[PDB]
Design a protein around this ligand. Structure first.
Ligand code: T44
Length: 367
């Protein structure tokens, strides 16, 4: 439906902003975790403070009113977090608000019930302790994956917004670790290579050669409800492919991907990136939230509350097993070969709601 479509466009707009902030470097975030976190924040906001968030998120208030957007994200969060057999998936977020400001009981229950949101009362006069509280909550929620989310914290800080995702899944076709090459050449520039181990399997994969956008798209299924999309642009075409990415593009690929026997070569690697979302969201329209003129009346009765920081970090491993620790010890040329040896874009999607669990660019897979 339309919400999936509107969230994917946000994902690619948010992605592009990151390409101007940090050009020619790795990008990695959970757009759905961000999109859901902002709506949640919005719930406690009033007037133009609230209005701005939903419009930066990509929604039109004439098309769909605020209550419908809430009920939609209500349903999206609930369906995602629903424990499905062979998949661990949790999209969550928290708030850390200065002890002197009392959040409303209605708001508290509403966000825990409808948005999977815990709200914490934190003392920000001890920026050291305050950091350790926050980081440990994300470290706890993500089962040790996302460590040390927040490095910097101003003495001013009044409210800190944190969003995250927990993801654990197996490949539908797991790789043979014995078939993994120890050191393969991987292009990052046009005049730099790095040694990345290269996993090797020949199996049936969905793929496409896009003649219009000048890239190869490969789909690798997880066993339950999730898939990876590897987008490999021809040389010099990385940025034009970045311009191309939209909801309209995915719909195209969904219609056109074909299954066949492929000699597949995929790098074994871990990617992580950490963001303070403020600089880009400020550019993208969310003003009044960070402002001294913030209206968060739905959240608290008493005065002086506003958003200090929105912080998010995404971590993902690509291994032989799936999204899990490897630690594993140690025929023909008439198959069409797909070899991911250059810098590529990467998408992790969830099937039933068409959400983007992860998006990013891998420029260099060795941190
Ligand atoms: N063909 C298979 C595999 C597949 C699933 C998804 I999820 C996807 O990504 C999107 C994202 C958005 I946003 C859409 O509106 C659509 I349509 C597809 C693509 I590409 C392929 C399937 O359908 O399960």
């Amino acid at each position: 439906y339309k919400m999936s479509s509107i969230n994917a466009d946000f994902a690619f707009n948010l992605y592009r902003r990151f390409t101007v902030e940090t050009p020619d470097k790795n990008i990695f975030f959970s757009p759905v975790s961000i999109s859901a976190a902002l709506v949640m924040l919005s719930f406690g906001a009033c007037c133009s403070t609230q209005t701005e968030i939903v419009e930066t998120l990509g929604f039109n208030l004439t098309d769909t009113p605020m209550v419908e957007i809430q009920h939609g994200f209500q349903h999206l969060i609930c369906s995602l977090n629903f424990p499905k057999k062979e998949l661990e998936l949790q999209i969550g977020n928290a708030l850390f608000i200065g002890k002197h400001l009392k959040p409303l009981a209605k708001f508290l229950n509403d966000v825990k019930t409808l948005y999977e949101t815990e709200v914490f009362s934190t003392d920000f006069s001890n920026i050291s302790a305050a950091k350790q509280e926050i980081n440990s909550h994300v470290e706890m929620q993500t089962k040790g994956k996302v460590v040390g989310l927040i490095q910097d914290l101003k003495p001013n800080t009044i409210m800190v917004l944190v969003n995250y995702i927990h993801f654990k899944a197996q490949w539908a076709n797991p790789f043979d670790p014995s078939k993994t090459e120890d050191s393969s050449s991987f292009l990052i520039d046009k005049t730099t290579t790095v040694q990345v181990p290269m996993m090797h399997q020949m199996e049936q994969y969905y793929h496409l050669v896009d003649m219009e956008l000048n890239c190869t798209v490969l789909q690798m299924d997880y066993s339950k409800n999730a898939l990876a999309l590897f987008v490999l642009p021809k040389e010099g075409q990385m940025e034009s492919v970045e311009a191309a990415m939209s909801s309209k593009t995915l719909k195209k690929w969904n219609r056109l991907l074909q299954k066949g026997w492929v000699d597949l070569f995929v790098p074994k690697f871990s990617i992580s990136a950490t963001y303070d979302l403020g600089a880009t969201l400020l550019k993208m329209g969310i003003q009044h939230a960070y402002s001294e003129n913030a209206d968060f009346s739905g959240l608290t009765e008493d005065n002086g509350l506003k958003l200090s920081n929105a912080a998010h970090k995404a971590v993902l491993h690509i291994g032989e097993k799936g999204t899990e620790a490897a630690a594993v010890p140690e025929n023909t040329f008439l198959h069409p070969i797909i070899q991911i040896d250059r810098s590529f874009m990467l998408l992790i999607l969830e099937r039933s709601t068409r959400s983007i669990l992860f998006l990013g660019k891998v420029v260099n897979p060795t941190e």
